[PDB]
């Protein structure tokens, strides 16, 4: 649902 970044939902991560 996102790249390997904190926000699973990719909320401007």
From Swiss-Prot:
Residue ranges crossing the lipid bilayer per the database entry: none
Superkingdom per UniProt: Eukaryota
Coiled coil: none
S-S bridge residues: 2-10, 5-13
Annotated protein name in UniProt: Guanylin
Gene name of the record: GUCA2A
